[PDB]
Amino acid sequence: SFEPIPIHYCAPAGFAILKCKDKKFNGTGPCPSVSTVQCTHGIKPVVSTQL
Amino acid sequence: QGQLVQSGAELKKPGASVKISCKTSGYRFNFYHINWIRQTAGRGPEWMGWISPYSGDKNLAPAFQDRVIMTTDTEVPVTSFTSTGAAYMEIRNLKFDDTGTYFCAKGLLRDGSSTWLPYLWGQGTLLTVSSASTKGPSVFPLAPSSKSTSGGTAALGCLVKDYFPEPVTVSWNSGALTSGVHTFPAVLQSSGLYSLSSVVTVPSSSLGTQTYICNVNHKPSNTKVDKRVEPKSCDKGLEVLF
Amino acid sequence: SVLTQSASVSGSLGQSVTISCTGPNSVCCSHKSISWYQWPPGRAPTLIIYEDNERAPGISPRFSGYKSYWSAYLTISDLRPEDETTYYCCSYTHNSGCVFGTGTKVSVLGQSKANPSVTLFPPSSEELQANKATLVCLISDFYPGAVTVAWKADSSPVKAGVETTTPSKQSNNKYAASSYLSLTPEQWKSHRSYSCQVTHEGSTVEKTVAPTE
Amino acid sequence: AVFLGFLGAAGSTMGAASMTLTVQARNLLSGTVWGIKQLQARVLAVERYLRDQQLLGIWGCSGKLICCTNVPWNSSWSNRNLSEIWDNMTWLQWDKEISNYTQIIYGLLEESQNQQEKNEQD
Amino acid sequence: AVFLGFLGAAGSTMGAASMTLTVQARNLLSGTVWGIKQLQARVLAVERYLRDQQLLGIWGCSGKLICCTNVPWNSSWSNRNLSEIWDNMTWLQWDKEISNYTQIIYGLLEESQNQQEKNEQD
Amino acid sequence: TTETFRPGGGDMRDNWRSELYKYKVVKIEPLGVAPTRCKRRV
Amino acid sequence: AENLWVTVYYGVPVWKDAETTLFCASDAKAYETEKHNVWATHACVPTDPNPQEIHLENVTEEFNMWKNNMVEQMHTD
Ligand SMILES: *[C@@H]1O[C@H](CO)[C@@H](O[C@@H]2O[C@H](CO)[C@@H](O[C@@H]3O[C@H](CO[C@H]4O[C@H](CO)[C@@H](O)[C@H](O[C@H]5O[C@H](CO)[C@@H](O)[C@H](O)[C@@H]5O)[C@@H]4O)[C@@H](O)[C@H](O[C@H]4O[C@H](CO)[C@@H](O)[C@H](O)[C@@H]4O)[C@@H]3O)[C@H](O)[C@H]2NC(C)=O)[C@H](O)[C@H]1NC(C)=O
Ligand SMILES: *[C@@H]1O[C@H](CO)[C@@H](O[C@@H]2O[C@H](CO)[C@@H](O)[C@H](O)[C@H]2NC(C)=O)[C@H](O)[C@H]1NC(C)=O
Ligand SMILES: *[C@@H]1O[C@H](CO)[C@@H](O)[C@H](O)[C@H]1NC(C)=O
Ligand SMILES: *[C@@H]1O[C@H](CO)[C@@H](O)[C@H](O)[C@H]1NC(C)=O
Ligand SMILES: *[C@@H]1O[C@H](CO)[C@@H](O)[C@H](O)[C@H]1NC(C)=O
Ligand SMILES: *[C@@H]1O[C@H](CO)[C@@H](O)[C@H](O)[C@H]1NC(C)=O
Ligand SMILES: *[C@@H]1O[C@H](CO)[C@@H](O)[C@H](O)[C@H]1NC(C)=O
Prior knowledge:
part of a larger assembly, 7 chains, B: mainly beta, Immunoglobulin-like, 5-stranded antiparallel β-sheet, 0% helix, globular, D: mainly alpha, 61% helix, 5% strand, binds a molecule of 6 linked components (NAG-NAG-BMA-MAN-MAN-MAN), binds a molecule of 2 linked components (NAG-NAG), binds 2-acetamido-2-deoxy-beta-D-glucopyranose, Transmembrane protein gp41 (chains D, E), viral protein/immune system
C-alpha cells in the first residue's frame, strides 16, 4: 500500500530534538519558549505539489 | 503455606504390619527437613528422628536407634518452586507404651544453625497398640435441644457409642454443614470399648431447607454410617419457638 | 525427661507472664538453642520463638523470650484468652536432635465463667429392643474445666457403671465433658427416675429422666 | 576454593549464592547471512552490559558486587525476617516476590545519591 | 523532591542546575533500510557514552558527578567572581565562554592524575 | 471405537521441534537488590 | 533494634524468559570439508575445544517445546 502513515523521527542516545512551542513562529531565529522531545509528532509522508 | 497430609493408622497387635505415610503440598520438598515426633500419655512428647529428602541424612534418637526405619520418596513437580512428595516410617517392636497419636513435621528453612527445626506440622495419625479385636461404631441420632428460647438457638447431633479402637470420624451432609459443630472426646469404658458424642448448633428456623446427614466413618472396621438427624425436637423450652 | 519447665504459672488480662525453662548443663544452655511452641492439647501446635528470641513468621510482636546461661524464659504480653493452654520449649543445635521440656500450663487469671449446659438422654427404642440401656449425660460450656459427675439410682448413690470423660477445650474457648451410665434396663426399672449430677465449683447442676413417662 | 560454576548458585539459598558472585559477572561479557545475526547479538551484549553498569554507576556504587546504601527497607516490600530470607530463599524466588516494587526502589536509589555527592563536596 | 526533568535545568542558573545532575546522566544511555539506520545510531550512542566515560576515568575521578582536582584556576579563563557565576550564569553561557580554553584544561587534568597515582602508591 | 494413525509432516517447523525440545533462551539480569543491616559510610 | 537497608548486588543468578538473536557454531573439522562453502558455514565461529555444562543443582524451570523461539528462528534461518 502507498498509505502515508504517521512516522515519528526519534534521536539516538545522547542526542536531543528541540520543539519550538511558539504560536507566531516564522521558522527562523530565537524561539522564546522551547521544549525538548525525543520523537516528533506523527508526521505522515503526504507527497504532493502546490498543495 | 501448604499443608502436610498425614496418613491414618490401623490398631495393631504386638506383631503386625506397621507403617505410616505422609504427603506434602505447596513447598519445595527437598529443601526442608522431615522430623518425626510421637506423643504418648505415659512419657510425653518425644522426638524420634529426622531425615532430609535432598541428601537422605537421618539422625534418630537412641530410643529408636534399632527399631524404627524412616523413608522418603521422589519429588513430583508442579511449578518452578512448589512440588509434591511423600515420606513413610515403619516402627518395629510394637510395645504397649507406643499407644498414642504421633506426627510428621518438616523443617523451618534451608540453611543455618536451625535448618530442621519443625515449623510446619501435620494432621495427626493415631495408634492403638492392642491385642483387642476391632469393633464397629454404634451411631445413634441425638435429639435437638433448646440453647436459648429468646435467641432462637438449638442443637442437634450424633452419638458414636461403643467403638474400639480410636478414632471415629464424624462429618455432616458429606461436608456441607461445618458451622457450629462440637465433637466431644471418647471415654474408654471398664470393658475396652470407647464412646463419644457430637453436636452441631444450627438455628431453629431451618426445618425443610437443609438436610442434616452425619457421616460417621470408621476406617479400621471399614464402615460408613450416614445418619439423618431429625430437625423436630422434644424439648419443652424450644417448642415455644416452633 | 531431662529438661524442666515450671509446674504452671498465672497472669491477668492486659498483663504479662513468664515461663522458665531450666535444666542441667548437658541440655542447657551453654552451646544450645531454645524454641517455644504454643501446643493446645489435641490440636496441632504453632511455632512461637526460634533461635531463642526470633519470632517465627506470622508471630505477633507481643511474644518474646530470653536465654540466660542456665535457663530461658518466655513472656506473653497483653495476655489473651486463647493463650490459656500448654506451652513447650526445646533445646536444639545444628547437628544433634532436639529434646522437649516437661510442659507448662498457662493459667490466665481474670476470666468470666459460664454455667454448664447439661443434657441427659435415655435409652432409645432400638436400644430397648436390643436390649440395652445407657444414660448419656453431656456437659458443655463451662469454665474452668473441672467437673465431677455423680449418679444416683432413685436418689440412692450408685457405684456401678460410671462413665466420665475428662473436660476438654472447645473451639469457643470454653470446656466440656461427657459422662454416661451403663447399667441394665432392669437396674433402673426398679428405680422410677434416674439422674446425673455435675458438681462445678460448688454449684452442682443435675438432670433427671423419669422413665415412667 | 568453592567454584560451582556460572549460574551454579541460582537454585541455592541466597546466602549461599552470595558466595559465588564473581563468576556470573565474569561470563556476562565473555569478551553474509550469518554476519548480521552475529554482529547484532554482539551489540546487544555490550548494550545489556552498559545499562546495568550505568545504573551501578549512578547509584554511587561503581564498585562491583555487593554495595550498601542508606535507603530504608519499606517493610511492605514482602516483609519477612532476615533469617527468613538469607537462610531460606533463592534469588529467582526473591526477585519474583520483589519484582512488583523493584522499579520504585530503583527510582529512590537514584535521587538520594546525588544530594549526597553535592553536599558532601561542599 | 525536585524533578524538573531531563535537561530541565539547561536554562536555570548553574548553581540551580547542579541540583539536577542525575537525570541527564540517566537518559544519556537510555538502555532492511531502517535496520542500518537504527543500528548505526545505536553504536554511536555507546561510543559517545564511552568517550566521556573514558575521560572521566583517566582523570582519576571515575565517580559519577561532581569531582574535584588540584588544578589551579588560571584566572585568564574568563575571570569572574564565584558569586558572579554560580548565582548568575547558565551552563550553555558558561561552556560557551570557557569553550576556547577547554581543550588545554582537558590536557592538564590528564597528566597530573598519573603522577599522583604513581607516587601515591610508592 | 478405535483409532488409526497416518503419516503427516505437513509443515517444516516440527522437524526442528524434534531435536530443539531440550532448549530454552533466557535473559541474564544481574541487578539483585536485597535487605541487610548495613549503612553506607559517612 | 535494627532497620533493614537495601544493598545493591551485581552478578546475581537471576534470569528471565525471553528470546534473542542466536548464532551458529561449527566443528573445527567442518571448516575442512571446504567444497567451496558446503551450504552453511563458510562464515561461522568454531566450536569450543573444551565445551562445558553447568548442572544447575536444586533448580527447576518450566520448558515448553511448542512455545519455543529457536524453532521459528532456525526455520527462518
Ligand atoms: C540444595 O538444597 C539443599 C536443601 O535446601 C541444600 O542442602 C542443605 O544444605 C545446608 C547447607 O547450606 C545444610 O545446612 C547444614 O546442615 C549441616 C548438616 O548437619 C550435620 O548433621 C547431620 C546429622 O547429624 C549429618 O548427617 C550431616 O552430615 C552431612 O555433612 C557432611 C558433609 O558436609 C557429612 O557428614 C555428610 O556427607 C553429610 O552431607 C551434618 O554433619 C550442618 O552441619 C550445618 O551446620 C553448620 O553450618 C551452619 C551454616 O550453614 C551454621 O550456622 C551452623 O552453626 C553449623 O556450623 C548446616 O546447618 C542442610 O542440612 C542441607 N539439607 C537440607 C536443608 O535438607 C543443598 O546444599 C543445596 N545445594 C546446593 C548446591 O547449594
Ligand atoms: C507432560 O507430562 C506431565 C506429567 O508427566 C503432564 O502434567 C500433568 O498432566 C496431567 C494430565 O495429563 C495433570 O492431571 C497433572 O496435573 C499434570 N501435572 C502437572 C505438574 O502439571 C503434562 O500435561 C504433559 N504435557 C504434555 C504436552 O505431554
Ligand atoms: C526476627 O529476627 C530478629 C533478630 O534480631 C528478632 O529480633 C525478631 O524478633 C524476629 N522476628 C520478627 C518478626 O522480626
Ligand atoms: C511504603 O509502603 C507503604 C505500604 O502500604 C506504601 O503505601 C508506601 O507508598 C510506601 N512508600 C513509598 C514512598 O511509596
Ligand atoms: C505482584 O502484583 C500482582 C498484581 O500487580 C499481584 O497479583 C501479586 O500478588 C503481587 N506479588 C506478590 C508477591 O504479592
Ligand atoms: C595562564 O593564563 C595566561 C594568561 O595570558 C596564559 O598566557 C598562560 O598560557 C596560561 N597558562 C598556561 C599553562 O597556558
Ligand atoms: C574565543 O576565541 C575567539 C577567537 O578564537 C574570540 O573571538 C572570542 O572572543 C573568544 N571568547 C571570549 C569569551 O572571549
